[PDB]
Every structure is written in C-alpha cells, then in structure tokens.
What does this fold into?
Amino acid sequence: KYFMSSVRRMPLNRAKALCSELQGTVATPRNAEENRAIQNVAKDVAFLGITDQRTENVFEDLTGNRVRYTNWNEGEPNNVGSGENCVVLLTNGKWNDVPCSDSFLVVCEFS
Amino acid sequence: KKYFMSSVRRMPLNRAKALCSELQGTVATPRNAEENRAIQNVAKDVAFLGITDQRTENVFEDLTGNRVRYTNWNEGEPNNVGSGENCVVLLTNGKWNDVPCSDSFLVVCEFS
Ligand SMILES: CO[C@H]1O[C@H](CO)[C@@H](O)[C@H](O)[C@@H]1O
Ligand SMILES: [Ca+2]
Ligand SMILES: [Ca+2]
Ligand SMILES: [Ca+2]
Ligand SMILES: [Ca+2]
Ligand SMILES: [Cl-]
It folds into this structure.
C-alpha cells in the first residue's frame, strides 16, 4: 500500500471522490504499522476509510468489511452532537469519530 | 521508486496538474523507456504527460521548466498543428503526440 495525503480539507464525500479519481480509496489502517505510516503522511487531522453509517457502533471500511484493528482515542467513539459516523486520525495517531459532513484532510491508499 | 496512477475522468492540462498536486504528486514525466512502459501499464486510454513546449516552441520541458532528455514521439510528431499544440499525451501504443493544452485526456500522476 502507498499512502498520499491531500493538502486541502474537504468532507467525506469529496474525500472519497478524490481517492477514487486516481483509482485508490480513503486509507484504512489494518494494523499499528499502517496506522503510523498514514499518520506520518498526514500533516493534520485526516479522514480514514471507516464509518458506522450502516449500523451505529459497527465500524467498517468503505467496502463493508468490518474493521478489526482500531486505535480509538480515550473516550472515543462517542457519537456526540447529532451523530458522528465518520472517522479521523488525530495528529497523535489515535482515532476520533466525527460528522461525515465536517471537513478534514484525506489520506488516500493505493496498491 | 516512482508510482504511477491514472485518473478515471478526462480533463485539460491545468486541471490535470491540480489533480496530481492535490495528493502532492505531479503529472507523470517518463525519464526513460522503462518509465514510459510503467505509465502505459496504468493508462487505459490516451493520457497527459507532464511535458510542454509552452516557453519556447519545439523546446520540451517538464512542468518545472526543466528541459527533458528522453522523448518517444509518434511518427510525424511533434507537429504543432493549427493554433498550436503545446502539451503532450501518451498514445495507447506508448508513443507520444503533442496536443492542445485545452483538450481533455486522462492524466497519469507520478509520486515517489
Ligand atoms: C488531425 O490532428 C490530430 O491528429 C494528428 C495526427 O494525424 C495529431 O498530430 C494531432 O495532434 C491531432 O491528434
Ligand atoms: Ca456513529
Ligand atoms: Ca467523537
Ligand atoms: Ca508546440
Ligand atoms: Ca500533434
Ligand atoms: Cl455523520
């Protein structure tokens, strides 16, 4: 896997469109090593290709596969506000669930 | 090593540049036959390369204004037809053609 980060922030829908444009997908860390690689390419909080949109508290990648490795920040995922179904990788490498409508950088993944 | 990825949609050069730069990459510029073939592997149709003779006609440079060495022009190219062809695309046979920068083609981005 190759990981590339965007320079501008955008909502999840636009983030997916960007990675898909070059035939990749939004980065989904499968272990601690990939998590670090993605963190390093991201210069700020960035979207990961994980959501619990289909079923609340059931986090899966953009292809519907349930995720095994997780690296949630203490207190997360909390689904606050009116709901948070998308996921971002914080600058310390931990994860936070956020509104998919909010704007963040995006790290795309390619094979 | 360099990694090459092709776009799904067609767009003019300036948009092609913006797309590759969005992920901090550049428009693919083959420096030898091996790279030219690697770009061929990912491009399913005619695609832009990061080369232009915008500064001086018939003097080809990469997008950073660095004059290129390796070229793989299709027979009869570059011909600067009509109002002018200052951008370059990789044909489906691996050879190159100069085309109008305002015309739309797929784009192959390069990363390292
Ligand atoms: C007629 O113009 C088109 O075809 C010629 C070759 O026939 C190319 O040189 C040119 O860039 C266009 O693609
Ligand atoms: Ca949720
Ligand atoms: Ca949260
Ligand atoms: Ca020309
Ligand atoms: Ca031509
Ligand atoms: Cl949401």
Notes: Residues 1-111 of chain A form a domain with the Mannose-Binding Protein A; Chain A fold (CATH 3.10.100.10). Helices of chain A lie at 12-21, 32-41.
